[PDB]
């Protein structure tokens, strides 16, 4: 509920490059500053003879908003023999898939082709570039002697990647082995150490991978999309992988053991061609210390009361329990052909409530199909099915839909306020936009009536100006507030107290404040956050029985509060927001007996 | 609140009333009976959309016998039978096809086959009354090839269904799109592998009878495909030779107005498949409503010849000519805030209901 959608940071790349196709955050361990990583798979690079090679750009944030390319590869196509190229980098889609772990940046080119040494062919094997420190190496786990359709020739390695907290690279290669698909996982140290530019096929010693299977599993695309998390309690991140065309195009998600690749779990879709497993993610969404699994199914059709099928998109959410069992519920999208669930991105604890929150996109939804991102808050019972905030795309289609929300990444705090931010790509317009999370204020608002019971003859005080005796009661209210991240010390609040308002407008109010002869009062209050409740007491009296609708009714005592929002801002102009899961309207009742 | 059924001369022979006008208030409802009466001896437009990848050459050679034999059998089911023809292979991009310069034109490596260049969808013959012309177009059809098992079936179907001005579909006909294959088809999101990340816009993109957005747009989803097939009143018949038949069969519940059968291993039943599929389709009547009017809800119950009731678009089965099916249509308004269309799936006639409101 706390994202700032009024003052986002907007970035752009070269027209037609699909800038924003893939996004991540770059956070060096000790550089003091952070950058955004935005891919542009069709970008025209300066490489000698490569067309639309693709690139990854490092984008700044503080001060100005500018992006510059990372030189992972600054050469052309290496020869195998005179006038006989080994590799084909044109249209390789470099930057299509980008991930970074602290200083380590892994960027892949899923459409990279090469000839192999055996025969002069052109196979879409796929390669990745891993950069750390000041050294860059080429990682090409499928560029092996196991070639062609029955081998890794059509692997497209690097199609989808992630990082393991153990410093391992998880790579999906959906085309391996007659498109059965393959997962390959290796160590960062091995990838960096065992590198030689004169060697095309490199073996690693601590490599894990899936193997071939029966033809019944052909065309499953295992490793279409990957994610990591601990699903067996071993302290080792395991491997979550989407296999969208598995089980007779129902789609499946597999979880493999992160240590030895033994299979641990198998999730299945319900509907054919829903493409269950398109995207996967894992995060603790309920505070149970067990990773939960989020599986998209963007083409899912939700049948209505008349039997009509509406293509909306679905996300399956399953919670991990200690027994190894999963508890699964279903979240449906909101709009037809919006493809809800095509992108899932854990945000970490966006609102600092103790539970992780998650963003789910629907890139073709909203007016003009600009694209929408839905923010869903977590809780102890699992994900809240009702979205708290909706982010809409801000650009018109030029030739294709902006596809806002196509790719997202959260759980990184760029503005350094304790509340993680969210980067959302919109590649159809060659843009990327960063939404920052506002600080959240929790407010303790009290209201008390002393006494709640009174009558018209209980004359206890006199009126101002002329000391006429009236019945009276005291109304007290007070307010304290705080937050968890970086908030202004002084919170400027507006409060209003209303008396006896439960009646027809224009009606006589019987309970009035003595000094104003009025049913209402407001005050300007300054609350130190984390300080004492600031209290006030106003004295109310009843009008006598000459001006009334009745004599014996309830008297409502009602308090409302809100923030000022003029002085309530940090150095970037980011304003705090009140917790949207609490009321700012409270009441007590008094009665005339 | 009322319902008015026009007493003006009707312009529909199957679906009546073809025009309804009602007046609603929130909390109110009104209803009427919609009658659907299937005809005998329809004009029929049968378009053959054929998978021409290498694995299909065994079935393609049998289409030479189909022309005249099918025409004769259909004489008892139709009044005017026209045949058309087109073909598809796959999207002409990596990794689906070879992109090697010496094997771009000839995807196959079998030196006994002078195979055709790969293509997405090509229209070969416009629907015609001439059987000989159909057989000729088939006889000269060459076989192509590709690398990945699945084929670009759904993409070709959408274009065949949508590009009415090129195919020559008649309004005054039962429109039949027959799809021949042995393998399953690609899905909309499978195209990501080829670097295609742009959704199918559902439009017609033919130039010289060739689909030219085949390499830039992804495959249509089943949602998009059923929407276009129903909108263009096209009934679909799948003819599948392989074990993959069951894959297509189990998609039928997701694609209203679709039927599927098996091609025998000898491919000797191509005509029986079409005739049986036709007879089955003509015997099933179901309706759906396109409701774009905000605040309005519909509840339709079919009343079958045997007195049974079947809700919504479940419809009635074992329906013949000289046999009327009734649809009990109730329209209710829930909230204040145009027209809706109620139509049998696979029929050319529709009933348009206009909804007037006051609050």
């Amino acid at each position: 509920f706390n994202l700032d959608v009024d003052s986002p940071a907007e970035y752009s790349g070269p027209e037609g490059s699909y800038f924003g196709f893939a996004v991540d955050f770059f956070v060096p361990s000790a550089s003091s500053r952070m950058f955004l990583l935005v891919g542009a798979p069709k970008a025209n690079t300066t490489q000698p003879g490569i067309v639309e090679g693709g690139q990854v750009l490092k984008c700044d944030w503080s001060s100005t908003r500018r992006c510059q390319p990372i030189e992972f590869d600054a050469t052309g196509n290496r020869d195998y023999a005179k006038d006989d190229p080994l590799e084909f980098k044109s249209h390789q889609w470099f930057g299509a898939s980008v991930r970074s772990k602290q200083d380590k940046i892994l960027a892949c080119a899923p459409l990279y082709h090469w000839r192999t040494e055996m025969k002069q062919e052109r196979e879409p094997v796929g390669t990745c570039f891993l950069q750390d420190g000041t050294k860059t190496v080429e990682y090409a786990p499928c560029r092996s002697q196991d070639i062609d359709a029955d081998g890794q020739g059509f692997c497209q390695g690097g199609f989808s990647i992630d990082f393991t907290k153990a410093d391992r690279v998880l790579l999906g290669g959906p085309g391996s082995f007659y498109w059965q698909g393959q997962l390959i996982s290796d160590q960062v140290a091995e990838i960096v150490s065992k590198y030689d530019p004169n060697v095309y096929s490199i073996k690693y010693n601590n490599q894990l991978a899936t193997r071939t299977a029966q033809a019944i599993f052909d065309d499953s695309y295992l490793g279409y999309s990957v994610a990591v998390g601990d699903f067996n309690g071993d302290g080792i991140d395991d491997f979550v992988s989407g296999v969208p065309r598995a089980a007779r195009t129902l789609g499946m998600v597999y979880i493999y053991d992160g240590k030895n690749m033994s299979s641990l779990y198998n999730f299945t879709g319900e509907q054919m061609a829903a493409y269950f497993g398109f995207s996967v993610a894992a995060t603790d969404i309920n505070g149970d210390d067990y990773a939960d699994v989020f599986i998209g199914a963007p083409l899912f059709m939700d049948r209505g009361s008349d039997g009509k099928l509406q293509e909306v998109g679905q996300v399956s959410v399953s919670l991990q329990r200690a027994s190894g069992d999963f508890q699964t519920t279903k979240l449906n999208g909101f709009e037809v052909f919006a493809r809800f669930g095509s992108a899932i991105a854990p945000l970490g604890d966006l609102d600092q409530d103790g539970f992780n929150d998650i963003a789910i996109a629907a890139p073709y939804g909203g007016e003009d199909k600009k694209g929408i991102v839905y923010i869903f808050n977590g809780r102890s019972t699992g994900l809240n099915a009702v979205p708290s905030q909706i982010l809409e795309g801000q650009w018109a289609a030029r030739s294709m839909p902006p596809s806002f929300g196509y790719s997202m990444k959260g759980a990184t705090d760029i503005d350094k306020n304790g509340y993680p931010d969210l980067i959302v790509g919109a590649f159809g317009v060659d843009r990327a936009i960063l939404y920052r999370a506002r600080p959240v204020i929790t407010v303790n608002a009290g209201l008390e009536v002393y006494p709640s019971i009174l009558n018209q003859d209980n004359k206890t005080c006199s009126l101002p100006g002329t000391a006429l005796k009236v019945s009276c009661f005291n109304v007290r209210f007070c307010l304290k507030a705080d937050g968890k991240g970086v908030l202004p010390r002084k919170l400027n609040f507006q409060v209003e107290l209303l008396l006896d308002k439960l009646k027809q407008k224009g009606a006589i109010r019987r309970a009035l404040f003595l000094y104003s002869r009025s049913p209402s009062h407001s005050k300007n209050m300054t609350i130190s956050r984390g300080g004492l409740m600031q209290c006030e007491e106003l004295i109310a009296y009843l009008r006598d029985e000459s001006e009334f609708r009745d004599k014996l009714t309830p008297i409502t005592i009602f308090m409302e509060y809100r923030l000022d929002y003029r002085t309530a801002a940090d150095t970037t102009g980011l304003q705090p927001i009140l917790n949207q899961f609490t009321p700012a309207n409270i009441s007590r009742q008094a009665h005339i007996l | 609140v009322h319902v008015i059924i026009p007493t003006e001369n009707e312009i529909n022979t199957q679906v009546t009333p073809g025009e309804v006008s009602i007046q609603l208030r929130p909390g109110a409802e009104a209803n009427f009976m919609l009658k659907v009466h299937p005809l005998k001896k329809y004009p029929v437009d049968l378009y053959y959309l054929v998978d021409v990848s290498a694995s299909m050459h065994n079935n393609i050679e049998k289409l030479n016998s189909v022309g005249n034999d099918l025409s004769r059998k259909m004489a008892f089911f139709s009044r005017d039978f026209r045949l058309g023809f087109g073909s598809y292979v796959d999207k002409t991009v990596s990794p689906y096809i070879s992109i090697h310069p010496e094997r771009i034109h000839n995807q196959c490596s079998d030196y006994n086959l002078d195979c055709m260049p790969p293509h997405g969808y090509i229209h070969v013959l416009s629907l015609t009354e001439n059987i000989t012309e159909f057989e000729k177009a088939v006889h000269r059809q060459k076989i192509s090839g590709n690398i990945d098992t699945p084929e670009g079936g759904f993409d070709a179907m959408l274009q065949a269904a949508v590009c009415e001005s090129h195919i020559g579909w008649r309004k005054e006909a039962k429109r039949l799109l027959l799809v021949m294959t042995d393998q399953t088809s690609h899905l909309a999101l499978d195209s990501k592998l080829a670097g295609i990340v742009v959704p199918n816009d559902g439009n017609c993109h033919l130039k010289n009878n060739v689909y030219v957005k085949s390499t830039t747009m992804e495959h249509p989803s089943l949602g998009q495909l059923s929407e276009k097939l129903i909108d263009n009143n096209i009934n679909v018949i799948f003819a599948v030779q392989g074990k993959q038949f069951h894959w297509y069969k189990d998609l039928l519940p997701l694609l209203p107005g679709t039927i599927a059968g098996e091609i025998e291993s000898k491919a000797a039943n191509l005509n029986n498949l079409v005739v049986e599929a036709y007879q089955k389709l003509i015997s099933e009547v179901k309706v759906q409503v396109e409701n774009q009017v905000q605040g309005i809800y519909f509840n339709i119950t079919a009343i079958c010849p045997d007195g049974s009731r079947k809700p919504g678009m479940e419809g009635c089965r074992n329906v013949t000519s000289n046999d009327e099916v009734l649809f009990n249509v109730t329209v209710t308004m829930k909230k204040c805030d145009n027209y809706a269309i109620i139509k049998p799936i696979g029929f050319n006639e529709t009933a348009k209901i206009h909804i007037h409101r006051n609050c």
Partner: antibody
Amino acid sequence: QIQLVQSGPELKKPGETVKISCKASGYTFTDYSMHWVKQAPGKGLKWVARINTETGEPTFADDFRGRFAVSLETSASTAYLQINNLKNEDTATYFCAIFYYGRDSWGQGTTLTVS
Amino acid sequence: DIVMTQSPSSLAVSAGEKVTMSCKSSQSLLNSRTRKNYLAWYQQKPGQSPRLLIYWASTRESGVPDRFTGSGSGTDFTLTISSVQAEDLAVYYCKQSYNLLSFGAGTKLELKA
């Protein structure tokens, strides 16, 4: 029905050149390549060459280069095999053929004798 | 290119017997991209042009009776005739189309006396 009609028997002396025709009917000539196969008088079949009738580009087997040439006259649906510098070893029946699986065909076989 | 070795060169049969003949390639004839074995069998009766019986190892050609069954994969292929007829006395050849087309020596069926 596809038919292939070859020229009649040829008798040549050593060193002479023979041109063997193959006329196609029943299909479009430029649709399928034309293959040539040599059958020595008592031995098995040896593939010699294929020509793509669409482009005119020949492909030869390793053992039949230099002395063999293949050409087209598309206007008359006819393919030709020319054998230069005939040797006694070239005595054989020469067949023209289409190997497309859907509709394969063979000519009657041209008998070539070298004295 | 690819040498096809066919064996035996001659095999005598009696009518009604099951007869097998085989052919061994020099390399694999299996196309990994199609999963098919590019080998075919031909029948040549004396005085006549040859006729295709089987293609892609086991796919039977139209007009060919089912007594002719092909099988095999990779490099090793077999042609078997169930209940051989007097009309089947012909020379059979194996052919590969993995690379340039090539034929084996051929197997002549003879009749037992």
